[PDB]
Amino acid sequence: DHAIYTAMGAASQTLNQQAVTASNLANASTPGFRAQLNALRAVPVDGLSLATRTLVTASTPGADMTPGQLDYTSRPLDVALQQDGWLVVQAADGAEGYTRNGNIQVGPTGQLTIQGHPVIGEGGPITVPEGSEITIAADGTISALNPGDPPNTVAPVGRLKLVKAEGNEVQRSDDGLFRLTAEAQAERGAVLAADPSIRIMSGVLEGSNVKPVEAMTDMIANARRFEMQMKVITSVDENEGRANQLLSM
Amino acid sequence: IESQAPEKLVYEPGNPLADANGYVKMPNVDVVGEMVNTMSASRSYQANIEVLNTVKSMMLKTLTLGQ
Amino acid sequence: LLNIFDIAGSALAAQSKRLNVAASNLANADSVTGPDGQPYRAKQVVFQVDAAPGQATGGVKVASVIESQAPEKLVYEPGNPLADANGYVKMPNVDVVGEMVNTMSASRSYQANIEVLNTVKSMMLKTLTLGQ
Amino acid sequence: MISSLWIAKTGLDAQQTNMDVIANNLANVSTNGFKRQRAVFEDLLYQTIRQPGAQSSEQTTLPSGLQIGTGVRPVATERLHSQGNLSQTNNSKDVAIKGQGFFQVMLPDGTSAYTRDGSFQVDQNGQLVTAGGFQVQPAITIPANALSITIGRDGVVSVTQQGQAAPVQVGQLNLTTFMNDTGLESIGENLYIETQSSGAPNESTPGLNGAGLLYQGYVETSNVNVAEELVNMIQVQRAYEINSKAVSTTDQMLQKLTQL
Amino acid sequence: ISSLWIAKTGLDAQQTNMDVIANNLANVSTNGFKRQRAVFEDLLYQTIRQP
Amino acid sequence: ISSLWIAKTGLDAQQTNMDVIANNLANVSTNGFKRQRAVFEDLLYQTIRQP
């Protein structure tokens, strides 16, 4: 009779997987989006005799740090990181989140702001002169040429800090921004170094790594598993109902 | 009591009742869990109804003690 | 009405009214004018929990069907009347994909409540044979 | 309603918005001075359900926690201000811009808008107007019997009279530059109005203080890259089909749930 | 749907442009004829408020 | 998804090449004009790890 619960669990948790895939799948064409891969965990129910039941709890082990594929836009300050690279960004609460969105923007007052909550590099938020005409180099240096000055005045105005971290040592933080896992904090510290070997691809953006192929069979298997759970539930309740005649008379 | 599910959100910043960063708060119902809850509740209710009937039959045949 | 019959029947009636709003909106998408001569303002239903006094829970009330305040997307036809200066017809603001998704959701909620009613009804028939 | 249906719904709406952007972008080829518009999306706040445990590292273990997340809300429609090509109209009153800058224009309601459009004309009174009668600021009034008009490379507009061997300097057609060009509020009719995201407008003569130069007889073209739009259309169509499949899968699962 | 409306406007504008081109081309060898150029203009923009 | 963007980048490179060719060809019979050649370059490579 308690079998139904286990089956229920599976059904319920499968819906959660569906949910993940859906959010994983609507976010195609979202810049620099990291697909949230998902798994199902068996959960044994260690008890006093005959360990027979296991639950099907749903989980998201992390994000897929597979570089999405690049779109060439020729915009001077659209940035693409190399593999395992991250742009550091001052989060809403204030802490160094990490993103792959290189769609940098400038405000009227010269705040470099990957979609606002600005970008962090070599100091606080990067600031540039208001008539920016920004150019971003390969290693991260940012040079600015005021529009009405001779072009041999492109002296660098800042540097864009980049950080190397991937997969096991990075987790999403309830915003599009990633942080370290607090297991990679009794390690390379709270604030990472600049790692002067991560390169920048200028004029090119990165799209989401939402693999449609594995998502489509994610959904196919999810549907099939769900209706298998429904069959188990149906048989269990019919068993119990037809059983209930024992106690009468 | 009141269930402590994380109170799922939706995003419709055209509907009122959506706060800053427009998010309609959308009650947190695990539909399949509630389906199964009703299913098992009916089954247990039926079991207890039967137990009532069986005990009454036991007692009415208790009255026929002797005669 | 017995208690659960009331709760589930209220769910069914509310879902039916939601489905009617969805059908009306879906059908009047791309409808230039109303009777008085006005954009067809798209409609929405707001679900309150019923039973304000007592236990604070149970059943759904959907009174006061209201108007969705999206901006009445415009088209340019300065040969058609009903266009103001800078000729712009008013062109209902119905989100068709939203209405299809809403229709499927309403149907599924409807069917779930039908199913709970079925199970509980079997339970009640068993109840009345209590003893006799 | 469960989260899967509405998440796929917001995916469908986002693809629809992207297609609206593309369609507008493609209709406005052959609109002088038009700037292509790019839709930028974003994910929504992730509803965490179970925080991850500790990586005990005794055995290689999966870091399983659980956060579901939702939504692909459109966060921006940027305007790419890159210089478009030029077309020769042979029209003397036409003008194109070399580099950053906009023409300031007085709207009927009294506010000042700004346009990167040069198809000028003259009203019956002689004032410079923009294909729609919007006065160009500061007002430039042409005498009645000008043989020819000339707008120089810094906007010094002058006319030639019958008899004078000298083009009386009749006006100055100065430009206006913004600190953040992308932030302008496009109100249609090829006009933008300045907003808090663009800063106050800085007015100056063309060629000075960062403003561009003026090319008479030429008009700027829309900088729409149709290859980008076609490939984006293919992307949008297939993403729409994928999200439609997601909705269908969730609906079928819900049907199977509600049968029993 | 709005995309269809937008694309219909684009098709109408291109067909008006072709009409202007064809009128110019026909009237070659018409004395004193002054050619025509169609100047276009975008429509109003729908604003969606960010919370 | 993937090959779509790769081929779009290829299209953009070919279009830039055609634009430069067109500017070279139009500016023939322009005094002292020095012709232009566009050099291209492949983008960042992604490394898939072998266990």
Q: Nearest chain A residue to B43 by CA: give it.
A: A241
Is B44's Cβ below 8 Å from some Cβ in A? no
The secondary structure of C25-63 as a DSSP string is HHHSTT----SSS-----EE---EES--SSSS-S-EE--
Place of tokens 């679900």: C47
Q: Contact partners of F by the rule of 3+ C-beta pairs under 8 A?
A: A, D
Task: Name which of B6, B23, B31 is nearest D49 (Cβ-Cβ).
Answer: B6
For A245, other C-beta atoms within 10 Å of its C-beta total 9
* Chain E, nearest residue to D119 by Cα: E39
CA–CA dist A97, A116 (Å, integer): 12
**CB atoms A62 and D72 under 8 Å:** no
Q: In this complex, which of C95, C101, C114 lies closest to D247 when CB atoms are compared? A: C101
What's the CA gap between E39 and D7, in Å, rounded? 43
Nearest Cα residue in chain C from B34: C116
Say yes or no: C115 contacts chain B, CB-CB below 8 A.
yes
Residues of C in contact with B53 (CB under 8 A): 129-131
> Which residue in A has a C-alpha nearest to residue F44's C-alpha?
A82
Pairing mode, strands D156-160 and D37-41: unpaired
Tokens of C22: 């969805």
Do B45 and C122 count as a contact with CB atoms less than 8 A apart?
A: no
Asked whether at least 3 C-beta pairs link F and C within 8 Å, the reply is no
Residues of C in contact with D13 (CB under 8 A): 95, 97-98
Which residues in chain D are closer than 8 Å to F11, comparing Cβ atoms? 227, 231
Chains A and E touch (3+ CB pairs under 8 A): no
Query: Cβ of F12 and A72 within 8 Å?
Result: yes
- Experiment used for this model: cryo-EM
CA distance D5 to D248: 9
Nearest CB neighbour to F15, from listed D227, D235, D238: D227
With an 8 Å Cβ cutoff, is E2 touching chain D? Answer: yes
Strands (E), chain D: 37-41, 48-50, 66-67, 74-79, 86-88, 95-98, 102-106, 112-115, 121-122, 128-130, 134-136, 148-151, 156-160, 169-172, 175-177, 185-186, 192-193, 202-204, 213-216, 218-220
CA angle D229, D235, D241 (to 5 degrees): 135
- Would you call F12 and D227 a contact, using CB atoms and an 8 Å cutoff? yes
Verify whether the Cβ–Cβ distance D6 to B21 is below 8 Å. no
Kindly report whether the peptide bond that precedes residue D138 is cis, defined as omega within 30 degrees of 0.
Answer: yes
Helix (H) or strand (E) holding C111: helix C96-128
* Integer CA distances (angstroms), A17 to A58, A229, C74, D64, in order: 7, 14, 40, 13
* Distance from C-alpha of C115 to C-alpha of C108, rounded to nearest angstrom: 11
Q: What is the rounded end-to-end Cα distance, in angstroms, of chain D?
A: 18
Backbone CA torsion sign across D35, D36, D38, D39: positive
Strand-pair partners of D172: D156
Q: Are D221 and D142 in contact (CB under 8 A)?
A: no
Q: Which of E4, E5, E11 to mutate to test the interface with C (most CBs of C within 10 A)?
A: E5
Helices (H), E1-51: 2-26
Alpha-helix residue ranges (DSSP H) falling in B1-67: 31-63
Whether residue B11 and residue D71 make contact (CB cut-off 8 A), yes or no, is: yes
CA distances from B50 to A247, B6, B45, B61, F6 (A): 7, 39, 9, 17, 70
Nearest to D147 by CA among D163, D165, D161, D166: D161
The Cα of E18 is separated from the nearest Cα of chain C by a number of Å equal to 21
Sign of the torsion formed by the C-alpha atoms of D134, D139, D140 and D143: positive
What the block records as the tokens of C118 is: 């079925």
Chain A residues touching residue F46 (CB < 8 angstroms): 66-67, 83
CB hemisphere CA count around C30 (13 angstroms): 6
CB of D234 less than 8 A from some CB of F? yes
Q: Which two tokens stand for residue A138?
A: 């390969």
Cβ distance A18 to D4 less than 8 Å, yes or no, reads yes
Q: SS3 of A204, please?
A: strand
Q: Give A232→chain B minimum CA distance, Å.
A: 12
Q: Count Cβ neighbours within 10 Å for each residue of D92-114 and write b for 16 or more, e otherwise.
A: ebbbbbbebbbbbbbeeeeeebb
Distance CA A137, CA A154 (A): 12
What are the tokens at D253? 């699962």
Query: To which residue do tokens 């208690």 refer?
Result: C3
- Who among D2, D70, D73 is closest to B9 (CB)? D70
Spatial distance between the Cα atoms of A167 and A181, rounded to a whole number of angstroms:
10
Nearest to A201 among F8, F13, F43 (CB): F43
Q: Is B54 an interface residue toward A (CB < 8 Å)?
A: yes
Report angle CA A233, A237, A240 to the nearest 5 degrees: 145
- Mention every residue, 6+ apart, whose C-beta is less than 8 A from residue A179: A95, A96, A97, A98, A170, A171, A173
Strand partners for A55: A43
